[PDB]
Amino acid sequence: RPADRSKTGGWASAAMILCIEAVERLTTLGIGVNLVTYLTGTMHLGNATAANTVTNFLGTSFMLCLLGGFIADTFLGRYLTIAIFAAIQATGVSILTLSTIIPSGIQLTVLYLALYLTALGTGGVKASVSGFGSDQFDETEPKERSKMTYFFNRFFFCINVGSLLAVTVLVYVQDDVGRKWGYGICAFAIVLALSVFLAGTNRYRFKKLIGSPMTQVAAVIVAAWRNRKLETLSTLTDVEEVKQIVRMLPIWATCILFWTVHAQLTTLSVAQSETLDRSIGSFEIPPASMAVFYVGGLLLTTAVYDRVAIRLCKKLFNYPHGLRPLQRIGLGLFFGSMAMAVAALVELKRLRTAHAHGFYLLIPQYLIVGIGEALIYTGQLDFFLRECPKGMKGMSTGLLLSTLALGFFFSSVLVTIVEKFTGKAHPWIADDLNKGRLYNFYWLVAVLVALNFLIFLVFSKWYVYKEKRL
Amino acid sequence: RPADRSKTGGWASAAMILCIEAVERLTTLGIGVNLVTYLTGTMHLGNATAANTVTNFLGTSFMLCLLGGFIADTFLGRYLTIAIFAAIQATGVSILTLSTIIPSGIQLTVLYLALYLTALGTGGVKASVSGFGSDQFDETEPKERSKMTYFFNRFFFCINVGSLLAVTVLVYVQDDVGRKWGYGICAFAIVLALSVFLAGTNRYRFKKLIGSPMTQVAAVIVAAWRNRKLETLSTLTDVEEVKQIVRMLPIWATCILFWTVHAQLTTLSVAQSETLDRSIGSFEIPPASMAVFYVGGLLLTTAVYDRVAIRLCKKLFNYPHGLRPLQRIGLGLFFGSMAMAVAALVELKRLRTAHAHGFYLLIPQYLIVGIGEALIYTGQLDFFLRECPKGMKGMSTGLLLSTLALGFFFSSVLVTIVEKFTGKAHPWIADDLNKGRLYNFYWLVAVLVALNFLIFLVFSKWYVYKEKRL
Numbered sequence: 055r056p057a058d059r060s061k062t063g064g065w066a067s068a069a070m071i072l073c074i075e076a077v078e079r080l081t082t083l084g085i086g087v088n089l090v091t092y093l094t095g096t097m098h099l100g101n102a103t104a105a106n107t108v109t110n111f112l113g114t115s116f117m118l119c120l121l122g123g124f125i126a127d128t129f130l131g132r133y134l135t136i137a138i139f140a141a142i143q144a145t146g147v148s149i150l151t152l153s154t155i156i157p158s159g160i161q162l163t164v165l166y167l168a169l170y171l172t173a174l175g176t177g178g179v180k181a182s183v184s185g186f187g188s189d190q191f192d193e194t195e196p197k198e199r200s201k202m203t204y205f206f207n208r209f210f211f212c213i214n215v216g217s218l219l220a221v222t223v224l225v226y227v228q229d230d231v232g233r234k235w236g237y238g239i240c241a242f243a244i245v246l247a248l249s250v251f252l253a254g255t256n257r258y259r260f261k262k263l264i265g266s267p268m269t270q271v272a273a274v275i276v277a278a279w280r281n282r283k284l285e286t287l288s289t290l291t292d293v294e295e296v297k298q299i300v301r302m303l304p305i306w307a308t309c310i311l312f313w314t315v316h317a318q319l320t321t322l323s324v325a326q327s328e329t330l331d332r333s334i335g336s337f338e339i340p341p342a343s344m345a346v347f348y349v350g351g352l353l354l355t356t357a358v359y360d361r362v363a364i365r366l367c368k369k370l371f372n373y374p375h376g377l378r379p380l381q382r383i384g385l386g387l388f389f390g391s392m393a394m395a396v397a398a399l400v401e402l403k404r405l406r407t408a409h410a411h412g413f414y415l416l417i418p419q420y421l422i423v424g425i426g427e428a429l430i431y432t433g434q435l436d437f438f439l440r441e442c443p444k445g446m447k448g449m450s451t452g453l454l455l456s457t458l459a460l461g462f463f464f465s466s467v468l469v470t471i472v473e474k475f476t477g478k479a480h481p482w483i484a485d486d487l488n489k490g491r492l493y494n495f496y497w498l499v500a501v502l503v504a505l506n507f508l509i510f511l512v513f514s515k516w517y518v519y520k521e522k523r524l
Numbered sequence: 525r526p527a528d529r530s531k532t533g534g535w536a537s538a539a540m541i542l543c544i545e546a547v548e549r550l551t552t553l554g555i556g557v558n559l560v561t562y563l564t565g566t567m568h569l570g571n572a573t574a575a576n577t578v579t580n581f582l583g584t585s586f587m588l589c590l591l592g593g594f595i596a597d598t599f600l601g602r603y604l605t606i607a608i609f610a611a612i613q614a615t616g617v618s619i620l621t622l623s624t625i626i627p628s629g630i631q632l633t634v635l636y637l638a639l640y641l642t643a644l645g646t647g648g649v650k651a652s653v654s655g656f657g658s659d660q661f662d663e664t665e666p667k668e669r670s671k672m673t674y675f676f677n678r679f680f681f682c683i684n685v686g687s688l689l690a691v692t693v694l695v696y697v698q699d700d701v702g703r704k705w706g707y708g709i710c711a712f713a714i715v716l717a718l719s720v721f722l723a724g725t726n727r728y729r730f731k732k733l734i735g736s737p738m739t740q741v742a743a744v745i746v747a748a749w750r751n752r753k754l755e756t757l758s759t760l761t762d763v764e765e766v767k768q769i770v771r772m773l774p775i776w777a778t779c780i781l782f783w784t785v786h787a788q789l790t791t792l793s794v795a796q797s798e799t800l801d802r803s804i805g806s807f808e809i810p811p812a813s814m815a816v817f818y819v820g821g822l823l824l825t826t827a828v829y830d831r832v833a834i835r836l837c838k839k840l841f842n843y844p845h846g847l848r849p850l851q852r853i854g855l856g857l858f859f860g861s862m863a864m865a866v867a868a869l870v871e872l873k874r875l876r877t878a879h880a881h882g883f884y885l886l887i888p889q890y891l892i893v894g895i896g897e898a899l900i901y902t903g904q905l906d907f908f909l910r911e912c913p914k915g916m917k918g919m920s921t922g923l924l925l926s927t928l929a930l931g932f933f934f935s936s937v938l939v940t941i942v943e944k945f946t947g948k949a950h951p952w953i954a955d956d957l958n959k960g961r962l963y964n965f966y967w968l969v970a971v972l973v974a975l976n977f978l979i980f981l982v983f984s985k986w987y988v989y990k991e992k993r994l
Contacts, residue, residue, distance in 0.1 A: 130525070130726070134722075137722055142719050145715055245614050245715055246615050248611055249611035
């Protein structure tokens with residue numbers, strides 16, 4: 055409990071903590087990627103009822119992540135938010151596993167809890183583990199930087215294996231073996247990982263910290279309304295700083311429609327998987343398992359771009375990376391409607407065949423999302439790091455999490471928006487995907503994403519003119 | 525973090541904390557009381573070899589309890605021990621459940637691990653949860669003592685029902701319904717109880733706690749080997765205070781042999797239970813459910829004594845209670861050998877019936893213990909509260925935990941001797957109780973505990989003259 059010591063505060067901070075972030079990552083795909091598959095046939099819900107029920111949970115997980123970090127900085131440490139919210143998810147996810155053995159009226163009540171209770175733990179844990187595990191940073195770094203910067207890339211490209219496995223074997227363990235084991239190992243994993251984290255409380259050193267903007271932004275919002283009747287250095291610096299965060303808004307709000315096209319891939323693009331040519335020789339591929347094409351698309355787009363950057367930067371002269379501030383976001387938003395347009399065409403080519411009376415077909419759409427996604431996220435991330443004052447740098451990861459969350463809610467609004475305006479004679483998102491006319495749902499989304507990208511393209515122009523004067 | 529506040533640190537400290545104590549106990553009985561039952565049939569082991577292992581596990585739960593209490597007091601918080609060691613048994617008691625469902629050589633290493641791992645988590649949590657949950661103490665107790673001493677008496681006779689039920693219904697679910705639910709639910713209880721304990725990390729004030737005697741006892745033991753060549757107030761009082769604790773030893777050691785009769789009751793009498801008249805009409809009674817008669821024995825005796833205390837104290841003039849300082853311990857030891865002899869004479873009355881070719885026969889041996897236990901325990905307890913200074917007061921419970929730990933450990937040693945000193949043509953404890961001549965094993969305990977009683981009486985005659993001479 056006193057102060058720093060080279061022979062105490064160590065690599066356990068690295069090793070024994072991030073295991074929770076790694077388990078939380080195994081969990082969010084392994085569950086979040088599937089779930090609709092479980093709600094469709096195991097719990098028995100309509101195709102337009104499970105996807106809406108899934109987006110809400112995934113979105114909520116990010117909506118929480120915003121508060122998770124804010125709790126961890128502004129109140130009762132970062133070591134507690136890991137301790138409490140790892141435990142909360144173990145309680146949550148262990149109930150989810152008991153929701154696959156005990157026995158809808160008072161079982162959906164039981165499932166909905168464990169689902170949105172896993173998202174509470176998941177949310178608060180993810181927002182603090184990574185930030186706490188990195189507590190391996192000295193003054194000028196006496197040879198720490200070497201092991202630290204390396205360990206994290208020896209962990210980051212390590213959980214990239216465990217992300218592919220989550221979509222591959224964990225799905226297969228749910229779809230073929232049983233949801234008892236599938237969610238069971240996600241639950242045992244977390245108790246085992248939380249127990250070891252708590253045991254290392256010794257080899258870790260906890261540091262004292264405050265969390266803005268939010269606190270500083272709220273104080274300015276108070277000054278606005280309390281001085282409504284009237285219509286020193288803080289006004290000459292701290293208020294002009296807050297106005298700069300309002301400049302991201304159009305770029306921020308336009309990015310929300312990319313996270314809707316990523317949400318269909320998790321839900322609606324799995325109802326198309328299950329209903330088309332499954333078998334490959336003797337054994338088979340699970341429906342959810344098509345996300346390997348999306349996961350691969352990310353991992354390939356990062357690897358290929360990491361080499362194909364200096365080549366782009368040398369041909370067309372730029373400062374650090376291959377023009378990844380604002381052009382990166384746009385490329386991902388162009389690919390965003392492209393996947394939705396490709397999916398619409400892919401639906402017409404085989405549902406029109408079903409009226410006359412499979413695995414290959416969905417691979418492209420899943421990859422077009424994976425390619426555009428690896429750009430937009432690193433475009434979004436490397437935006438307010440380079441385009442926000444250093445007082446609020448890294449304190450605008452919420453500007454990433456608030457893009458996501460709202461993208462899931464924008465999908466769930468859209469799904470319900472076509473549930474009433476097309477129902478019930480011949481709806482798009484039909485209970486029997488073949489009976490209805492689903493492709494028209496992509497004609498609404500692809501179209502929204504295309505026209506959204508057009509306004510984004512006009513926002514960037516009005517930004518390199520209105521924010522290049524500050 | 526900062527300082528106490530009446531508007532926060534209250535009943536939440538009493539409720540959310542102590543829920544792990546109820547869970548900790550519930551578990552220890554349901555798991556511990558059975559286990560032999562599992563090992564015998566489920567895991568396929570000899571009756572002399574299963575008992576031996578389980579006494580060491582139990583004995584450990586209490587041996588770890590000695591260490592745990594000290595760990596918490598001498599290093600990094602009590603809260604932290606409750607948090608860490610609740611998570612150790614959460615993991616430890618779930619691998620026991622995965623030991624029931626996944627599948628001897630490898631399956632035993634996994635079991636022993638998971639058992640001895642639970643004993644680790646159980647010892648540390650048991651020793652602290654009570655000590656922390658009771659942090660509702662101010663200077664003159666402004667109406668705290670009223671609600672606090674009411675909550676601790678309300679919570680006491682709540683876990684007495686649970687201890688009843690742990691033997692009654694949790695055993696049914698282990699035997700009849702399959703362990704999986706029995707050992708599984710024991711785990712769900714803790715994961716939940718650990719998250720909820722961490723939910724109230726708000727309404728908790730962590731006091732500036734100090735740990736002893738041990739820290740002082742060790743310094744005196746350290747001073748002996750370095751003052752070998754020599755053959756201000758620390759010698760004039762701390763060493764004088766340390767030598768007074770060695771006076772407990774004769775009696776302290778004598779009690780160990782009661783806890784051996786309580787252990788045989790847990791082990792061998794559960795193998796006798798399963799080989800005798802089960803059928804009680806339509807439904808059947810579980811073998812390990814005989815322990816209800818010992819629980820009743822503890823319960824009924826505590827209820828009966830508290831009412832008939834002033835009556836015995838009036839007829840024979842005494843100060844606070846009806847003569848329970850040392851004389852109480854003699855009563856429990858007399859009852860101690862009374863149960864083994866009754867259990868010996870019971871075997872002759874029906875294992876002789878087996879060779880010539882049942883449920884009520886095992887009811888007295890459990891009652892005689894339970895009665896004798898309620899006297900020897902409070903006797904042992906109210907021993908060093910009055911016969912030790914207020915500096916080491918309550919730091920004499922370690923003498924109680926080392927009576928149990930060594931008492932259950934003594935069974936394994938006892939059996940080990942009698943297994944390797946009688947076999948293998950006609951041994952005492954055998955896989956087939958009808959075959960083996962076990963009746964005399966009970967006479968051996970009955971004799972070693974009868975001797976012990978005579979050894980105790982001699983020691984008590986001196987303890988009222990060699991310690992009263994002060």
